[PDB]
Design a protein around this nucleic acid. Structure first.
Lengths: 271, 37, 93, 46
RNA sequence: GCUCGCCGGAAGACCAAGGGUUCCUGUCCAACGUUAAUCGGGGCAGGGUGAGUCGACCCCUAAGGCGAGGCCGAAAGGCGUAGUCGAUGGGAAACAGGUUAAUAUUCCUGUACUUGGUGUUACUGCGAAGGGGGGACGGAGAAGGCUAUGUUGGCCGGGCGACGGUUGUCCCGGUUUAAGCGUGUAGGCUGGUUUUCCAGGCAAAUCCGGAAAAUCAAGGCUGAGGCGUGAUGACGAGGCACUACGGUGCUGAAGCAACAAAUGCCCUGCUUCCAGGAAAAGCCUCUAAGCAUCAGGUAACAUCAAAUCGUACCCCAAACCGACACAGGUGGUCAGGUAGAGAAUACCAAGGCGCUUGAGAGAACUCGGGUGAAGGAACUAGGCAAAAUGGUGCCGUAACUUCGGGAGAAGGCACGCUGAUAUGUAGGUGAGGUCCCUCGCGGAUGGAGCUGAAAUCAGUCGAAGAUACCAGCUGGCUGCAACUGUUUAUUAAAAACACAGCACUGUGCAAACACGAAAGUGGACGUAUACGGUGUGACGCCUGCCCGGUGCCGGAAGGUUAAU
RNA sequence: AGGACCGAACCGACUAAUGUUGAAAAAUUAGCGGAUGACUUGUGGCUGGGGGUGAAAGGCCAAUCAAACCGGGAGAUAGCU
């Protein structure tokens, strides 16, 4: 659900926060946590490689099983927990043998819902099974690229992948971007679509809500100087140039995909 | 006893403060030049 | 045990002071300069041996040498180790 | 007025100390030039 | 030595960093001290820094550094695995009194505590580089119980007082006592016990987890404080005795209660909200291989060991950083009385200082202030500066608006002291005594005693009762920017930058892009509700026409065209 | 609850005066803004010269910045003084 806060403060005027009482309020599961240190956008050379990254709240990583290779054992979802490293929400799920895992939660998945995997798993949301065993045209998320690699497609909140046709060796997927690409048959995938589709409905409200998420200010090109950016100077709001990246590459229209290795899989491109 | 005297000269031999004469002497030369255009 | 040569090159000289005299007569302890690298174990075994007394415990410290100038030339006196050795009821030296 | 040199011997040893100079070849050229010139306090260790 | 003055949330005290003998005593005034100098942080000599418990060393790791092999690179070299190092973090234990001119959790007195090695006695399963638990920990808010600590009364000791009174509801001082041990509380957490089974915890496991029952409704964990012991000990106002007249030996009464109360403890808790909140070792269990009448482990007693290094002194400053004995800068800890909401402010307590030139004169002029006739911005670029407002409660408060605000809008009334209500109110706190149980650090009761606002009525004094310090000037029209923020350290704080919001564009993951000859890394342990770039900059109404030029995207027919 | 309100520590620097061979190579004095957050601060580390970093001034990078400092080519060159 979304709630509009009363504008008792000027910073609280335009903030709409997504509330969800179904999420857990207690501490997360201890043996599935590990250290995830902040990078600040700086690589091993220490130089800033991706800018505007820094600050923010401290985050602890949660090992989410994107592989789902535990096959044939029924599992029951314990609770739904917040994951700071993903837009979606994760589900702490307990298997029949008594060992717990974190799975990426679809829409209807709540506490007490059964989860099965394998060729014997039923066609209901949350169940993971090879793509050749999936009916054509159903809602599918957490899609592998190569078999056994772990889920790589339609991971973030509100996402889904539609199966257009099955060749038997390859399966054509209409991705969330509107791209049609071929994916080999035996990659595993999860039914349904992920359960945080209202995540795009929130608005941060103030500058501090973007700062404590780890995002720094993003100074624009025409306020720069000629020695830093191709845009700059002009004795007051002069642009007179084609818009480019800070390193001179033309933006706003120029295509820059030069992969030439996965071009055989792309059936048709997004538009 | 007075080696510091030889060294305490060597302070404004590499100054940069263009608003002051020889780095330390404050003047009105800014205004004088500004108006002497 | 500690062999004889080491135990010997350890006690250098006794230290004389009015703090030493009050420590000698009232608390029954002796303060004497020892070797630079000497430890409390080698110091205690020596005073048991060469001084035939009933040593109890050893308190040690090192005084950093004072900086003095001779004429105009500056210099630093050699730092020495200080040691408080204490005994039970018996002493004649 | 906080000035530039606020001392700390932990930073002082870690930046220009002897083990820092010996760690790379360029500091080895520095230590050679201290010896070639013949400076008494050739390093900043003590 | 007697006064006067200044600080007293410091200009007091203790430290860390930093300094490196400035610390203490004796001795001298060459130079240093912006003056004299007998003095000194100056010169010379001597002395002074005592640790199983303080800190370092040591075990463990964060950011990161190095990096056997490995990969890559003209060379030098770069990245990086296993490892290794790296506190600002986690790990065992000491407190009270006394002593020096200078040392104190170090020395002495008294009372403690912890960890290993070894021996003996008694029992019997020990045993990892592995598994699990624990270490393990976000912000804000709210009390409750406490304590530090302060006030008052009682008690003890002392005094009848320079000038009216003062044997009294009078005046002054003290009324202190730790660690540790035992008790177990105010609280907070968790249902407990037993049995059976299991695709998991790489193998294994009695341990973790999971699934079935039976049985009981209670145990367990954590936990401030108080209490008794420690402690018929120390300290104690003072007195006695010698006085190197500085002090030094001897002796020593009362040593309680009530109230108030922390930012300190319970509390690493409780409640609540998203921005969802270190690692590893020590520690507790589980076994594996092996050991298996051993090796070991466990409980009691005894004994040994706890090394090495720093311990002075300054540390908001004359001793560190500022070339100076410099109006500056410098992180942490303690924090009393009165008034006061308060760590503000004013005066004070303990404590420390009067700032390394003084003595006169009482010109102009300059700096810092006080007052002022009459006018009240006429000065000036400009109310710059100065002046004025200031607190609490109550009444009352407009246009406009995103309904929150505006707004402390504006504008008024009361404020001291004394008595009565009420020989101090409401309230808080609360003993004796009574009753009842598990039978205690208990439950109901009961009001002694202590504390104590707020208001009304009545009277009084002054020119003035928020009388001192402290402590909003207000309103109307309007440009710009939505706003909180950030910026040219050192002439520009803004209409500049940022910002949430919006739009375009790129990118299907070995992504785009960026750093790198490369390896590799960030992006991101993220996956188109994501990430990058560009432009605009909340919100409301909207964002019209033009693709000829340039750029970008799509096209391949034809013309031109490289090496070959 | 609040990038809430008033106001100390703390952070900063809007106005004026003094100072400007200063007490000080940017301060003092009277006022002033923020003061639970995009806050502030101690300790250590990381990013380096046509490079870093920058809520963007061409600012900061050891009182030095439209290309730091030190040494070297170097006795650069100077139709100029």
């Amino acid at each position: 659900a979304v709630v509009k806060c009363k504008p008792t403060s000027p910073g609280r005027r335009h903030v709409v926060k997504v509330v969800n009482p179904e999420l857990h309020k207690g501490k997360p599961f201890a043996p599935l946590l590990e250290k995830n240190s902040k990078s600040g956008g700086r690589n091993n050379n220490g130089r800033i490689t991706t800018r505007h990254i820094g600050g923010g709240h401290k985050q602890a990583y949660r090992i989410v099983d994107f592989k789902r290779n535990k096959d044939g054992i029924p599992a029951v979802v314990e609770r739904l927990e917040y994951d700071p490293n993903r837009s979606a929400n994760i589900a702490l799920v307990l298997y029949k043998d008594g060992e717990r895992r974190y799975i990426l939660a679809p829409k209807g998945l709540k506490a007490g819902d059964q989860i099965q995997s394998g060729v014997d798993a039923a066609i209901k949301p949350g169940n993971t099974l090879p793509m050749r065993n999936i009916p054509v045209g159903s809602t599918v998320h957490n899609v592998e690229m190569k078999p056994g690699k772990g889920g790589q497609l339609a991971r973030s909140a509100g996402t889904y992948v539609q199966i257009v046709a099955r060749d038997g060796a390859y399966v054509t997927l209409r991705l969330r971007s509107g791209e049609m690409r071929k994916v080999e048959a035996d990659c595993r995938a999860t039914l349904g679509e992920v359960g945080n589709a209202e995540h795009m409905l929130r608005v941060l409200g103030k500058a501090g809500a973007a700062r404590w998420r780890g995002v720094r200010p993003t100074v624009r090109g025409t306020a720069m100087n000629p020695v830093d950016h191709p845009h700059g100077g002009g004795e007051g709001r002069n642009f007179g140039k084609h818009p480019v990246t800070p390193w001179g590459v033309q933006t706003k229209g120029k295509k820059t995909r030069s992969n030439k290795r996965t071009d055989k899989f792309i059936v048709r491109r997004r538009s | 006893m007075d080696i510091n005297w030889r060294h305490n000269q060597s302070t404004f031999y590499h100054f940069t403060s263009d608003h002051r004469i020889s780095g330390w002497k404050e003047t009105n030369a800014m205004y004088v030049a500004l108006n002497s255009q | 045990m500690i062999r004889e040569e080491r135990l010997l090159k350890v006690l250098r000289a006794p230290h004389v002071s009015e703090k030493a005299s009050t420590a000698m007569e009232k608390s029954n302890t002796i303060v004497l300069k020892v070797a630079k690298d000497a430890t409390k174990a080698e110091i205690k075994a020596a005073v048991q041996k060469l001084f035939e007394v009933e040593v109890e415990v050893v308190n040690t410290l090192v005084v950093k040498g004072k900086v003095k100038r001779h004429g105009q030339r500056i210099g630093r006196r050699s730092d020495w180790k200080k040691a408080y050795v204490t005994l039970k009821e018996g002493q004649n030296l | 007025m906080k000035r530039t040199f606020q001392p700390s011997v932990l930073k002082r040893n870690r930046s220009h100390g002897f083990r820092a100079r010996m760690a790379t070849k360029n500091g080895r050229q520095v230590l050679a030039r201290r010896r070639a010139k013949g400076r008494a306090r050739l390093t900043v260790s003590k």
